[PDB]
Design a protein around this ligand. Structure first.
Ligand SMILES: Clc1ccc(C(c2ccc(Cl)cc2)C(Cl)(Cl)Cl)cc1
Length: 1142
């Protein structure tokens, strides 16, 4: 997308904004510099500690630490002041820029031509306003400041690192390709296994969605278990691939960890080697290592601010392009002539018009008609071809592309737009009143009269009928929006607003339609009465306005043909001759699902606690490496440095193997849990009632996405949640115990400062709740008035009251500005304290450690071990979705055990071998949850016995919706409804689904599907297909019945689909067939073939015709009707055939 550079992004910065920007940039540079200086002083402090320890195998530690502590405090103060001031200046600049941007943007929008409004209109502009203003505010806000600080810190870190230790800096840098190639291998393996995992998961999700989409036919057939088998097998394969992906990702992360630790080890070994030669001192190596580390990590961390800068740049580009767009018609400029008086005439000389958007359409061609003032001229049209366009034009909404206007020897182009607009009075068909009092709404219009005639106008508009006895005499506090008016009321206030001193001319554009009869009469009377005294040309189609007239205007497609009497219009064949015209599940209940796989979770937790404890060991090894650089014997130094670098590598390897094992076990547990949850959820889906599913929240898409996503998400709350919490607990507990043992004093001091980091945020949240509230509310209401302005641009411009809307917008914007400044200041203080607290804690803790060292309670490395352990524990926890996983698990649990509302999978009940053929329904009062309000079902008492051919037609909304669904046992034959063997009833039926849905498998498999209790034999499949007449077309196929049919829905006709559906149905060879108007949506020949096949299959077999056309119903015995689930209009075929004459 287009993006502007820095020069344009800040174009709307004045001098006041520029000074703030300059100060912010300079202060941010200083802030960025401060951290590398911190590292330099840290290295010097380490050197001083080592010197004191070396002397004892002096008091200079006390004074040296005192000086370094004063240094640390001054760094703290400078960072506090600098960071607060940087954030404050940048936020203030953002606020001023955003305020001016909103002002100018709305000003320009209101300026744009209507020919430009119609091109993007309200949605684009409101989106732009909200989103893009957010983007621009976030761009030039604190984010650019953080970018500048990142640059400064990176450059300063590199320069100090080079200037101090060019050799060791070069070594650290040259170790970077190691991490680079580690990441390369990471990406390779990740991409390969990720693609494989997507393929595997999709292979099962496809079957999931195939079943869910066609659940009706999937379940109507006794094939609810073969689906379970298919899902089980596909999900087992997906489990294998998923565990492969998990182990791959874990090994990649472990290799990254191993390589970073190996980089540490090599760097420290080289530092030792140099120190032995006495080139770099321990302080120097520590300084250079930490400065390079901080530089790298800071560049990484401010990578995300780059994206914010870029998005802000793009949004700014579009906003600025809107700002600079100059409308062809200037609604604000005062350039033009203002004739002191105007006779009020109107003329047009072949004004050619085309909409700026899609100018190919040409409606106004050769429009030439004049109306001398003091006259009223009627208008007509069929599609509103010309009238709307010309009424828009007279308002200067669209520039006359070719023509001349000679209004009293004046051209509308050459006169002031505001004077022209106010010179005439026009109101839309339904002008949505602005969110104000009715008095203020009538005041809108001509402010020339403010109160005195504003109250008088009511008497003219026939609105007073309620105003005098309204809730208030003229409506203070009435508001509107919350209160509702009748259409006649809105129209009456509209005519009042029009008649508030409309100077000469008054027009109305289809201002009569969409009105009740009483309102129609009232408004017609009002229009008639207000016609007198001024030149009126109203666009309308009503008969009353049609008959009343003094002149006529005729252009049915934009063809001016008539300008005279009414009788002439009649003679002109006009319309005057066509007058006829969810309890959040707890942790324990979630773990009850992996209760089965606990063996894997146990080893996972054990290896996780080992992984966590490894971090404190890394802190302790850091303490020991720092301490062991103070040994006078050089050989001992080499031995210890070699051993500790080796132990660094060993901790890396332990972390690597432990991450690998963790990956293996937690992946396996998570995949087993996912398979179990998916299988249980699918089983619950199948068994549950049919009326459940059609619910909008139970949409096929909803269930599919739930199965795909929430299933995996649930892994986030059983093992990995336990693993992460165990790792964190082990890390902090071990760190705290080690620190306590080394010395409870410094342990307590660092622990006591730990609260100050976060607890200080309580005030931040207190002041930020107000921020969020004002943000949502003020955005909503300011944008609401913006949407009112833009969406009613027609009226807003025609009212000539754009400035008044601007003033309302600005007054609304006032409070957000103050709240934004408060937010800037409070965020600035919180950020400054968060930044300076680390420096202050360093200073205080190290001074205390010096004291304890002198007293004798803490060894030289005691302070380093305790501080490093606590700091690295904090970092580890900070590095280390749970609520989302809990929510998904709650939904899945309530799903898998919701209720057996209509137990369908219940294979209970007794099934006599013989089915007597009774379709009797006794005492069943039910109603569909889809249509419970509408009478669906009552004490149904329908009758059909064996050998019948009953037909039916539903007068109201496809009566099939009732009888087949009920009889199909979706919602009894002499036996109780639920006592019967539902499996037997579902098995012994010839129900044909409406739309034949075939399954993604062999045609042989689809044929065999009709039965799933017993396997299939090819001989019988052929028998059924030939009996189904489908063999005819199947005779030409790649392999025939067994064909995979790799087309997957191309080489199949509707008739072929119906034939295969019938073959599937009759595979059971049932003795009672049922239809659901399936034999439809096909060509006449296809339907004839379908009926021929069905009749052939009906040879010596009972059926119930439920077809939709007489062609099928020809071979029928009796026809029926059903209303509200009760027998009605039962009769013989000939009688009801006479009924449905059609
Ligand atoms: Cl497992 C782990 C621990 C610490 C780290 C980092 C780290 C890097 C350098 C140093 Cl000296 C300490 C910790 C962060 Cl958390 Cl600070 Cl980003 C990374 C991974």
């Amino acid at each position: 997308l287009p993006m502007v550079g820095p020069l344009a992004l800040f174009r709307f910065a004045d001098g006041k904004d520029i000074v703030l920007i300059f100060m912010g940039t300079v202060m941010s540079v200083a802030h960025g510099a401060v951290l590398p200086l911190m590292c330099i002083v840290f290295g010097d402090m380490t050197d001083s500690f080592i010197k004191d320890s070396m002397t004892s195998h002096q008091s200079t530690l006390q004074e040296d630490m005192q000086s370094f502590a004063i240094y640390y405090s001054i760094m703290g103060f400078v960072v506090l002041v600098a960071a607060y001031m940087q954030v404050s200046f940048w936020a203030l600049a953002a606020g001023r820029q955003v305020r001016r941007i909103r002002k100018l943007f709305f000003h320009r929008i209101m300026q744009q031509d209507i020919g430009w409004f119609d091109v993007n209109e309200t949605g684009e502009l409101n989106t732009r306003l909200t989103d893009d203003v957010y983007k621009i505010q976030e761009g030039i806000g604190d984010k650019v400041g953080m970018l500048i600080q990142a640059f400064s810190t990176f450059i300063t870190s590199f320069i100090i690192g080079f200037v101090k230790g060019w050799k060791l800096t070069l070594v650290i840098l040259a170790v970077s390709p190691a991490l680079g190639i580690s990441a390369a291998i990471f990406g390779k393996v990740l991409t390969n296994f990720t693609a494989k995992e997507q393929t595997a998961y999709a292979k099962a999700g496809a079957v999931a969605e195939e079943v869910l989409s066609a659940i009706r036919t999937v379940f109507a057939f006794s094939g609810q278990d073969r689906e379970i088998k298919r899902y089980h097998k596909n999900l087992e394969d997906a489990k294998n691939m998923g565990i492969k992906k998990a182990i791959s990702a874990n090994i990649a992360m472990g290799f990254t960890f191993l390589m970073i630790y190996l980089s540490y080890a090599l760097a420290f070994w080289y530092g030792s080697i140099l120190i032995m030669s006495k080139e770099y001192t321990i302080g120097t190596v520590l300084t250079v290592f930490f400065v390079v580390l901080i530089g790298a990590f800071t560049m990484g961390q401010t990578s995300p601010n780059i994206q914010s800068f870029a998005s802000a740049r793009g949004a700014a580009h579009k906003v600025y392009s809107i700002i600079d767009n100059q409308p062809c018609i200037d609604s604000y400029s005062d350039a033009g002539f203002k004739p002191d008086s105007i006779k009020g005439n109107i003329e047009f000389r072949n004004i050619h018009f085309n909409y700026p958007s899609r100018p190919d359409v040409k409606i106004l061609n050769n429009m030439s008609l004049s109306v001398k003032s003091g006259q009223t001229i009627a208008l007509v049209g069929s599609s509103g071809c010309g009238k709307s366009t010309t009424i828009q034009l007279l308002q200067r909404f669209y520039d006359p592309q070719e023509g001349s206007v000679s209004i009293d020897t004046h051209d509308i182009r050459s006169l002031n737009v505001r004077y022209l607009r106010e010179m005439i009075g026009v109101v839309s068909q339904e002008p949505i009143l602005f969110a104000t009092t009715i008095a203020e709404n009538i005041k809108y219009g001509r402010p020339d009269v403010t109160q005195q005639e504003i109250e008088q106008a009511a008497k003219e508009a026939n609105a007073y009928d309620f105003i005098m006895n309204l809730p208030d005499k003229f409506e203070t506090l009435v508001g509107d929006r919350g209160t509702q008016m009748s259409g006649g009321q809105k129209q009456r206030i509209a005519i009042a607003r029009a008649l508030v001193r409309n100077p000469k001319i008054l027009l109305l554009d289809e201002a009569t339609s969409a009105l009740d009869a009483e309102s129609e009469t009232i408004v017609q009377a009002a229009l008639d009465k207000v016609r007198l005294g001024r030149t009126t040309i109203v666009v309308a189609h009503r008969l009353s306005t049609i008959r009343n007239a003094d002149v006529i205007a005729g252009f049915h497609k934009g063809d001016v043909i008539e300008l005279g009497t009414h009788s002439q219009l009649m003679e002109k064949q006009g319309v005057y001759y066509t007058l006829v015209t969810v309890p959040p599940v707890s942790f324990l209940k979630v773990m009850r699902l992996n209760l089965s796989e606990w063996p894997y979770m146990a080893l996972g937790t054990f290896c996780a606690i080992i992984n966590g404890m490894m971090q404190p060991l890394f802190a302790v090894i850091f303490s020991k490496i720092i301490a062991v650089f103070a040994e006078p014997n050089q050989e001992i130094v080499r031995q210890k440095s070699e051993f500790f670098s080796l132990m660094f590598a060993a901790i890396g390897g332990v972390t690597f193997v432990t991450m690998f094992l963790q990956g293996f076990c937690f992946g396996k547990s998570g995949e087993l849990l996912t398979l179990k949850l998916r299988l249980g959820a699918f089983k619950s889906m199948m068994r549950q009632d049919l009326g459940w599913f059609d619910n909008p929240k139970n949409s096929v898409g909803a269930l599919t996405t739930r199965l795909a996503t929430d299933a995996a998400q649930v892994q986030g709350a059983t093992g990995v949640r336990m693993a992460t919490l165990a790792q964190n607990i082990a890390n902090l507990g071990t760190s705290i115990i080690i620190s306590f043992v080394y010395g409870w004093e410094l342990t307590l001091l660092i622990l006591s400062v730990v609260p100050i980091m976060a607890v200080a945020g309580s005030v931040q949240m207190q002041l930020l709740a107000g921020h969020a509230a004002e943000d949502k509310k003020e955005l909503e209401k300011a944008g609401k008035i913006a949407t009112e302005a833009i969406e009613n641009i027609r009226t807003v411009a025609s009212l000539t009251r754009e400035p008044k809307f601007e003033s309302l917008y600005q007054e609304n914007l006032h409070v957000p500005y103050k709240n934004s400044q408060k937010k800037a200041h409070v965020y600035g203080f919180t950020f400054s304290f968060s930044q300076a607290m680390i420096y202050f804690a360093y200073a205080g803790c190290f001074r205390f450690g010096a004291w304890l060292i002198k007293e004798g309670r803490m060894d030289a490395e005691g302070v380093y071990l305790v501080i490093s352990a606590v700091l690295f524990g904090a970092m580890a926890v900070g590095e280390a979705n749970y609520a989302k996983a809990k929510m998904s698990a709650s939904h899945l649990m309530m799903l898998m055990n919701r209720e057996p509302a209509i137990d369908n999978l219940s294979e209970e009940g007794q099934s006599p071998d013989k089915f007597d053929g009774n379709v009797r329904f006794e005492g069943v009062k039910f109603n569909y949850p889809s249509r419970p309000e509408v009478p669906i079902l009552r004490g149904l008492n329908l009758k059909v016995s064996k050998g019948e051919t009953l037909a039916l037609v539903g007068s109201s909304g496809c009566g099939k919706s009732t009888t087949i669904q009920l009889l199909e046992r979706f919602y009894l034959d002499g036996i109780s409804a639920k006592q019967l063997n539902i499996h037997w009833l579902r098995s012994q039926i010839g129900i044909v689904s409406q739309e034949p849905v075939l399954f993604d498998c062999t045609l042989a498999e689809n044929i065999a599907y009709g039965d799933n209790s017993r396997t299939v034999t090819l001989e019988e499949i052929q028998a059924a297909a030939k009996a189904a007449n489908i063999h005819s077309f199947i005779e030409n196929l790649p392999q025939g019945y067994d064909t995979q049919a790799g087309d997957k829905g191309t080489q199949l006709s509707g008739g072929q689909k119906q034939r295969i559906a019938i073959a599937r149905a009759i595979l059971r060879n049932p003795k009672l067939l049922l239809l659901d108007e399936a034999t439809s949506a096909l060509d006449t020949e296809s339907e004839k073939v379908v009926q021929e096949a069905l009749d052939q299959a009906s040879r010596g077999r009972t059926c119930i015709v439920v077809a939709h056309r007489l062609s099928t119903i020809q071979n029928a015995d009796r026809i029926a009707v059903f209303q509200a689930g009760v027998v009605v209009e039962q009769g013989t075929h000939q009688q009801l055939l006479a009924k449905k004459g059609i």
